[PDB]
Amino acid sequence: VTDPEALLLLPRLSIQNANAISSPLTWGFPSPGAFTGFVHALQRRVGISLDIELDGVGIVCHRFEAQISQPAGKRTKVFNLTRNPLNRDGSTAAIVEEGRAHLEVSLLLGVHGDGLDDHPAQEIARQVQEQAGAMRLAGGSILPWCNERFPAPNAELLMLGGSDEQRRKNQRRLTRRLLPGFALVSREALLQQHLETLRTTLPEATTLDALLDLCRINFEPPWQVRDKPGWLVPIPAGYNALSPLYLPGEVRNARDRETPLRFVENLFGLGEWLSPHRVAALSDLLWYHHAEPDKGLYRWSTPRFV
Template sequence: MSNEANVPQNPAVLVVPHLRVQNANAISSPMTWGFPSITAFTGLMTALERRLGRDAGIAFFGVGVVCHGFEAQVTDSGYTRAFHLTRNPVLRDGSTAGIVEEGRVHLDLTLVFEVNVDDAHRSEAEAQLLAERVAHELAGMRVAGGSVMPPLPGSARQFRRPLLELRYDDSQEEARSKQFRRLARRCLPGFALVSRDDLLLDRLAKLREEQPEASALDAWLELASWTQRAVQRPPKNGETEPTVEWVSDTRIGWTVPIPVGFAALSPVHPAGSVAGARDKETPFRFVETVWSIGQWISPHRLHRLDDLFWYPTTQPDIAADAEGEIDLYCCRNDYTPPTPARLAEASV
């Protein structure tokens, strides 16, 4: 992964629009299913940078994901769903091979990368050539375990071309805003995934007002579920008895439970010391999934490009529990929810 010490300081944004991904992984963690984990896209970003090589003149820092289409490969029967599973060939002795459950989903995605480019790609023509090269390399890679498919016949080609533009600095606020609005329109219609850790903290604080022993898991499960409550209504229209009505709890937007990274379960083991590890040259560590809350929001409701990007971060020893320190390897997103004053302005 790139760092600020070894890349030229020409910040830019790279948009690869409307990738058709077939059979992407729909089981994003041990407790969630649906859209692939954001770690799949930060991993894709790192793999893409390595595949392009240092001589390409581009370095990747963050990735934003906008979903235009989602088609889960499931059977739908009321409240029960089941994945479409493949039947494996029989074994040598003719017996039936075991079925490993795999969740798949077809996606239509736009990927927005925060990048740095060298001086040779500052011109519009050179930037477009570099964007085309990145899109070509990406077309031959796996995206969240799925295959990138060519555009459907008859699709609007003008919105399928990748775009690479230099970003304006902080002193050019108006130009930065116009650039963001123009790029946001290219991502419509669609929904961008952003982090809402603040909702998890707020819900945990409210739960602990009534249940001091409540944990973050309790708050996460509440935010991840649809909750209905029985509300007693006073008599009306000549009725003598009060009525009971089931009311769903309100939700702040389209919120979803998401995995955002991993927490260490063990110290770092030397390379090759753990049996069964796929890479014998890299130090090994046992980890478990870290969950949070995300929100799908239309790109035109964001206020800056930085709201869109997810960054892979290594945060050793920042969290502590009763047994000691915990190392985290998580994806960070800098989305800032609108204030009440901003919401009032948007509703006018």
């Protein structure tokens, strides 16, 4: 919703057991809403004391490992589980299938505020790094890099460049820092135009079928494969309204009785993983919240991408 005055690079963060089930329809890399919520929790915890705002997160995902296995005779996969403790009668409890993933991601954070002029860049960078080293990113603990060879501090780069060439060199150096990974971006325009292409191909086609067609490998008879522009993952694109926004004390057993609750349904969109050298600026990769609370639509996206 705003252009960041600076970009803070949180380095390689090893998230231990992240929620591999991103959505009721998708598994794998966690939701971008988890990353945006983590950055908002960082702004809630240490952002206010530094007189800065932390909005917008760019994910690089340097490493992914899924705690999964492939059973023999099946082409699908299953989630490795954890043994929950027994009940009070000594019996095994009912198992809820929860999957885990070891992530290694680096985050570009959009920083704007007067506190950037009040503190050194390395000071606020080290403060938000040591705050983020005791938090969670998708349900997993963050490994804060103890007793390895060379630890990685941040590099907060001011986006108000004095010259266009110096700004370009800064963005290319920051892209070179986060090199072995893929920027995950939102593709609402690509999914909508592919929906229009399928509607010209066949009418009454929903956005779900256009999302599904952009993920399966289509085999065409003369036997070739229908190509895709990018990786084109199905991402959770936010939450849509399923109920009116009830009063803060209205909903029974809410998390807090001061925040209003509204039952939601998952919104599914198309995301794309790209090499981060294929972007004009690294501020395009930032994932922003977008509530629009009168109509539900509690989305996260990448505005100012293309």
